[PDB]
Ligand binder design. Structure first.
Ligand SMILES: *[C@@H]1O[C@H](CO)[C@@H](O[C@@H]2O[C@H](CO)[C@@H](O[C@H]3O[C@H](CO[C@H]4O[C@H](CO)[C@@H](O)[C@H](O)[C@@H]4O)[C@@H](O)[C@H](O[C@H]4O[C@H](CO)[C@@H](O)[C@H](O)[C@@H]4O)[C@@H]3O)[C@H](O)[C@H]2NC(C)=O)[C@H](O)[C@H]1NC(C)=O
Ligand code: N7F
Ligand code: N7F
Ligand code: NAG
Ligand code: NAG
Ligand code: NAG
Ligand code: NAG
Ligand code: NAG
Ligand code: NAG
Ligand code: NAG
Ligand code: NAG
Ligand code: NAG
Ligand code: NAG
Ligand code: NAG
Ligand code: NAG
Lengths: 727, 733
């Protein structure tokens, strides 16, 4: 039979089908099919046409995406999409009135809009343009300008700056409408004193002089952006006077030094919760703020303030967890690390400081998915004690013993990794199984957790794959110091335990990482195992996630230590299996995985023949403040400078004489600056180590343009094949 | 015996000895021996200690260089040397008083000084600091500030900006003392509207944020720096008033558009000559300017202007040639292209337009070396009709048929490439033979051209090389369309014409290049031939120099055409030789050679298996104005934009699917910007062509730091060895 080839991976010959729906009520969803939008009844599965694929035939611009107002009266059409960072972009927008069949031609959303969002009910709009916020009460009416301080690279109103986008909110938006749309809350970031990262951008060959891109980016220990928080009442805006925004100040325990705003969650129409985190990220404070109708102000009583602190590490997996408030806003549920270091759901009353744990065990809650009047729905890795599996559960709010696993037993051999999408009030849910078998999308009723129908079963892909020699995936563990450490192996087709195969260790190994799981993927590793007969392994050692704080916090203040040592130990635990050729063990990774690959190659272990680091971190002082300091503290003599200096790739340069190394980096990487690889290469040159390199002109951290993506995987495939003597 | 290995090349195991002397008079020279400065009598060869080595250790810092004042009373000590571009650098300076035997610690030359020079007689000093000129009449006295307009990256007084340093003066200095030191002439450059090239500099790993280096650099067709010229009388400076600089303006034939100052040559104590060149570099004017006692100004008589133009190309090899004035300053000798396109010596009278050629023939004068009342001494490649040879000749000024070759027959098997250093009034001359045998330094007296003695014969190196399997060099020619084109081959030891060797074509091929010559070199090619048994060949095709304008101007307005085609043709001719393996032909080059290598690899010729381009030009609009426009004109639709767009490496990307390519570039290259290779790689990625790359962090055009130099040659050696199917060798660590 044929194999899954590199061209198959690069050209997406074998496509995974999805079933992306958008819930519009508690009983119906929208589903885009053949460019027309259908509305489905969840109970019976019948549909009607919501919006025909011919409606916008005469539009004149290619439509990137759409957003229907929650009341179904209008549609926002996004076009002229121009990417910025991981989440940010600018675009043009048109509004179409679905009842009148008219495009709005006056008081339009401006071109180069940075963010736009409908209110959660009705059809108000808030948007950010030139770093200032604007509100439109009706699509055909003029905008009210909320802020006047917006300034490129300095003041950001309602949008995040680079570090808050990448490391805190995972979004460009910094706008939060209240549940019924009365209030619009927003953050303001000030990057005045934040230093700029500067790099060249070459552009098309017609550009005679390269451009210098300058981005406010705080490296570890550098001056950070400051933040303020405001709430404006959108129902009391005037065309005559400027809008009044009410500031909600951070608590005094945060104002004493540098801090961050880390979560914004509306609890009710008149109550908002804010979480603040100290720059030393082991202390966080949640304020619960209530609107005072008599003064028009927002007050956060200390009686409703909650503290979260960590004595062994930082707070949260990547940040303090989100609270899930009951409808009345008087209580909330939140994931918290318990006394044994396992993250479980805690129930809080707003004015009581000790929470009650509602789940427990040597496993963790991954996320809270829905909170109804009677049940809380959550995803965990409890099932079979497998940290790399995910299943949906529900728990009765009045009786914590009444737990039901909703997905564990549906299709246990095919499906061990689920996510979920609930309807507006959770009467229905779509389950999305991503492995170990082919992804499966099903619809269920929460009335008694009964299956309704299969939405997408990937039968088309299954038929195409029957003709292909596909690899298999093994998920198991090794025991070190009486602790299980999980690994996965992508095994070549017709795998023979008596034979010896080359092995490639695919590594991430950053804090809270998980590379051993039950997910079905079609990627470069599939090609390496299917066509090249390489075993592609990954291992989750100390520092990895979802297994409790004794493992995750093992690398606290000590990156580049145990997680590096554990990848080497894993390869020792593998290299001695009679199926592993110990003369052909390689290692590769991107980003944090590039850092760990480089630290492993520089370890002098003698285990690895070769390795590839793509856009690696090389020294923690070069990476951003929020991520780096969470695990490393500050690079000062009083704090953790000694370990910052001891954990660099450059200090290990002499040991690279023992290995074949390929170092790759995009020149326009705004995230892990090209500087990091420029310092590695300089250190290798300074000690007389030969190595392979590749820069990618004008590519960023993703090296994701169509041509660059094909080129990097082609180059890396030649490198691994030469390392392993594969024809 | 052992071979000449890569480590031998990288560690300079086999060192060529030199004999660098400094003439101080018409009969004496200075020479550094065991860190001591000795003064030698040319006639007898006896020496005396001028300055003991120990003196250099009484400062507390290492001395980079020294300069003894012309009167021998002071020594200028250079330290804290910090390199800038090819020629420019800053340094600290101390002056030591040889008569008082003491360091001068008062009114010191400032730290970060950009340029310093003694007057040509006596001990005056002129220096440039913070882009302004200062003059010291006595080394321990306060300096007189000459200019007050200096401003970093904007106004340069007495020093060149980037493009004038690299492309016009081949120096950072823009100061010219008059012969007896009365006057100090200087240029002022104004870069206000010149765009900046910006690139990152990473520095030591402790630097948290990379630095952006910003240099005013005019790319082809961009706004150029403007220039002004001034002369100050240093004998009439006041401690009370500011100095009066007298401006000398360019002739109006230059002022009509963009132009350059291209030569400054003093003729007498009161006469200076200047050459100006239009931005379209086929028209130049020499002005002859006299000091006027009645006004205190400089008069450039219009009747004394000399125009030099080119109808087939640009003026001069790289710029108009320098004039050599007779003692009275009423006439001068200058190398000019004759009616047949050969560069020969012309004799001019200052007030007469037509010149008289004093030499002729199908060969060229390389340079005028000395001029006395009876003779003119010059270097040419006349001997044996070999354009890659060099010899010293003398011509009687009273009879041009009376030409004597001074070096041709001294040692014809060992010595075919000479340079010379004459004493102050040409009473003696040192001859420096650089090949084909080991370099040989000899001293001669001009009266009857008597050989006085051998100064350095490299006998120590000869003894070492007797135990090494050294390669040989063949210099010959191929005939193309009734024209001889020369080539050289570095041949492996025990060369067997019955065996098939791999061949690497080492290319420069830029306008006026010469890669086929009689010079003895110990370089990477020596290792490739000696140890790896690779033939390293070079070829001088169309556009190459020293063979007349018909060959040199063939590429006028057409870079990336005939010089590229000729390298492919040369390799075809070599590949047919039964001693070349046609399956193992590679090409490599740096700079213009990188551009040619890349154009050859993208040609689709099928001749070359692989190649390496180091810091290549990829598109002419990315390179500097002065060099680029000299050959290409302007990148405008009205001028030569079509050819600028047709001669890029990027347009040939699809053809690289047929070859193995290694692209290398330093990230801090201020000369051929990293941009050039960044656009090549992007074009190769865009067509799906695999290739090998290497960047060199913080290295410039030379990739010349000790560690980067070793690394680049090691990386290129592995690449060539793999291309040629040659074996590898393990090493302990
Ligand atoms: C998926 O299929 C569902 C099942 O058919 C669809 O639901 C149906 O929607 C229609 C339209 O909203 C409802 O229509 C009428 O309902 C009552 C009468 O209901 C009775 O008869 C129905 C059969 O005709 C039964 O289905 C009911 O159970 C019940 O016995 C009428 O009184 C209404 O009239 C009013 O509204 C119409 C406009 O809609 C006006 O024209 C009238 O003048 C009057 O004002 C509706 O005609 C129907 O009841 C409902 N059936 C259900 C829920 O069981 C569902 O819409 C579809 N979904 C999609 C996305 O396609
Ligand atoms: N999601 C996510 C990830 C993350 N971050 C989440 C929080 C925000 C932070 N800026 C980035 N990093 C960590 C990281 C640390 C420092 C610098 C950059 C990124 C990594 C990472 O590293 N890998 C690994 C990873 C990323 C991409 N491809 C890979 C291919 C093979 C092996 C590993 C791979 C995978 N995912 C992430
Ligand atoms: N001297 C000198 C050179 C020169 N210039 C003289 C005038 C001023 C100009 N800026 C630089 N270029 C030409 C050039 C053109 C464009 C960009 C940069 C340089 C070259 C060049 O190209 N090579 C070739 C050359 C240079 C160095 N090493 C080599 C190794 C192998 C093969 C060839 C090599 C050699 N010398 C020179
Ligand atoms: C957006 O840009 C287009 C193209 O220039 C222009 O026609 C249109 O009027 C702009 N829209 C707005 C809202 O300014
Ligand atoms: C931004 O912060 C700077 C100090 O870093 C301050 O001077 C400035 O007023 C602030 N701007 C706003 C709009 O808060
Ligand atoms: C609103 O504020 C802006 C910026 O301060 C100002 O220019 C404008 O005059 C204000 N408008 C009113 C009505 O006060
Ligand atoms: C929205 O909530 C606000 C705040 O309580 C309230 O004043 C308003 O009436 C609510 N709107 C609706 C439509 O219920
Ligand atoms: C937070 O971290 C700092 C730095 O490691 C430490 O000094 C402090 O005690 C920590 N707080 C807790 C509660 O552990
Ligand atoms: C196991 O314990 C030993 C002894 O304390 C320690 O050195 C090693 O790092 C541990 N390895 C793990 C936890 O993988
Ligand atoms: C060389 O010797 C002569 C005497 O013959 C003497 O006058 C002269 O000074 C000497 N020169 C040196 C530099 O020793
Ligand atoms: C040069 O720098 C050194 C070190 O800072 C200083 O001691 C010295 O005085 C400086 N010299 C002059 C001439 O300014
Ligand atoms: C430099 O040139 C600019 C025009 O480009 C002019 O404004 C300026 O005055 C000049 N400066 C000097 C000192 O000549
Ligand atoms: C010399 O020129 C400078 C700069 O224009 C000026 O500051 C200074 O006062 C002048 N000195 C005299 C003595 O005129
Ligand atoms: C130097 O030349 C100038 C200009 O002719 C003259 O005034 C001066 O006397 C000369 N110096 C000597 C030492 O002859
Ligand atoms: C100089 O070159 C330009 C462009 O080729 C040409 O138009 C002009 O005639 C040339 N001048 C001479 C003197 O040949």
């Amino acid at each position: 039979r044929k194999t899954y080839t590199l061209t198959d991976y690069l050209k997406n010959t074998y496509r995974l089908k999805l079933y992306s729906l958008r819930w519009i009520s508690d009983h119906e969803y929208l589903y885009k099919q053949e460019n027309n939008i259908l509305v489905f009844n969840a109970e019976y599965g019948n549909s009607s046409v919501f919006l025909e694929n011919s409606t916008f035939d005469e539009f004149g611009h290619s439509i990137n995406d759409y957003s229907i107002s929650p009341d179904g009266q209008f549609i926002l059409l996004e076009y002229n999409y121009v990417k910025q960072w991981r989440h940010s972009y600018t675009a043009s927008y048109d509004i179409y009135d679905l009842n009148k069949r008219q495009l709005i031609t006056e008081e339009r959303i401006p071109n180069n809009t940075q963010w736009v969002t409908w209110s959660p009910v009705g059809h108000k709009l808030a948007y950010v343009w030139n770093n200032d916020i604007y509100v439109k009460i009706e699509p055909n009416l003029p905008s009210y300008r909320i802020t006047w301080t917006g300034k490129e690279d300095i003041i950001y109103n309602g949008i995040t700056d680079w570090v808050y986008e990448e490391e805190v909110f995972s979004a460009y938006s910094a706008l939060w409408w209240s549940p019924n749309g009365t209030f619009l809350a927003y953050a303001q970031f000030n990057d005045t004193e934040v230093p700029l990262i500067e790099y060249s951008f070459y552009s098309d060959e017609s550009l005679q002089y390269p451009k210098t891109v300058r981005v406010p980016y705080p490296k570890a220990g550098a001056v950070n952006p400051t933040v303020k928080f405001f709430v404006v009442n959108t129902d009391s805006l005037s065309s005559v006077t400027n809008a009044t925004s009410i500031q909600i100040t951070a608590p005094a325990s945060m104002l004493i030094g540098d801090h961050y705003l880390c979560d914004v969650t509306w609890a009710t129409q008149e109550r908002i919760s804010l979480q603040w985190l100290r720059r030393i990220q082991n202390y966080s404070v949640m304020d619960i703020c209530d609107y005072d109708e008599s003064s028009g102000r927002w007050n956060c009583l200390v009686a409703r303030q909650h503290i979260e602190m960590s004595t062994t590490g930082w707070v949260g997996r990547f940040r303090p967890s989100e609270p899930h408030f009951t409808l009345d806003g008087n209580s909330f549920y939140k994931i918290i690390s318990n006394e044994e270091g396992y993250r479980h759901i805690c129930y809080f009353q707003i004015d009581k400081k000790d929470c009650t744990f509602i789940t427990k065990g040597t496993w963790e809650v991954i996320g809270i998915e829905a909170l109804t009047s009677d049940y809380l729905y959550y995803i965990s890795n409890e099932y079979k004690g497998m940290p790399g599996g995910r299943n949906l559960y529900k728990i009765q709010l009045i009786d914590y013993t009444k737990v039901t696993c909703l997905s564990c037993e549906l299709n246990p051999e095919r499906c061990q990794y689920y996510s979920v999408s609930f309807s507006k009030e959770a009467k229905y849910y779509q389950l999305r199984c991503s492995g170990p078998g082919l992804p499966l999308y099903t619809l269920h009723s929460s009335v008694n957790d009964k299956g309704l129908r299969v939405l997408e079963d990937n039968s088309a892909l299954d038929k195409m794959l029957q003709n292909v020699q596909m690899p298999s995936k093994k998920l198991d563990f090794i025991i070190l110091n009486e602790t299980k450490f999980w690994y996965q192996m992508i095994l070549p087709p017709h795998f023979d335990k008596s034979k010896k195969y080359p092995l490639l260790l695919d590594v991430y190994a950053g804090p809270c990482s998980q590379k051993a799981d039950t997910v079905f993927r079609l990627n470069w590793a599939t090609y390496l195992a299917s066509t090249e007969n390489i075993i592609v392994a990954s291992f989750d050692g100390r520092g990895s996630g979802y297994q409790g704080d004794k493992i995750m916090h093992a690398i606290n203040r000590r990156l580049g230590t145990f997680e590096v040592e554990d990848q080497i130990e894993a390869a020792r635990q593998f290299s001695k299996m009679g199926f592993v050729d110990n003369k052909r063990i390689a290692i590769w990774g991107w980003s944090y995985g590039g850092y760990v690959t480089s630290m492993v190659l520089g370890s002098g272990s003698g285990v690895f023949k070769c390795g590839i680091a793509v856009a690696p971190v090389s020294r923690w002082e070069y990476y951003d403040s929020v991520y780096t300091e969470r695990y490393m503290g500050l690079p000062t003599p009083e704090d953790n400078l000694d370990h910052y200096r001891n954990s660099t790739v450059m200090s290990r340069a002499e040991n690279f004489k023992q290995v074949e190394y390929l170092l790759i980096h995009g020149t326009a990487d705004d995230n892990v600056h090209f500087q990091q690889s420029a310092q590695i290469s300089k250190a290798l040159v300074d000690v007389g180590v030969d190595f392979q390199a590749m820069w990618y002109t004008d590519e960023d951290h993703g090296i994701a343009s169509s041509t660059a993506h094909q080129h990097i995987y082609t180059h890396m495939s030649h490198f691994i094949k030469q390392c392993f003597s594969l024809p």
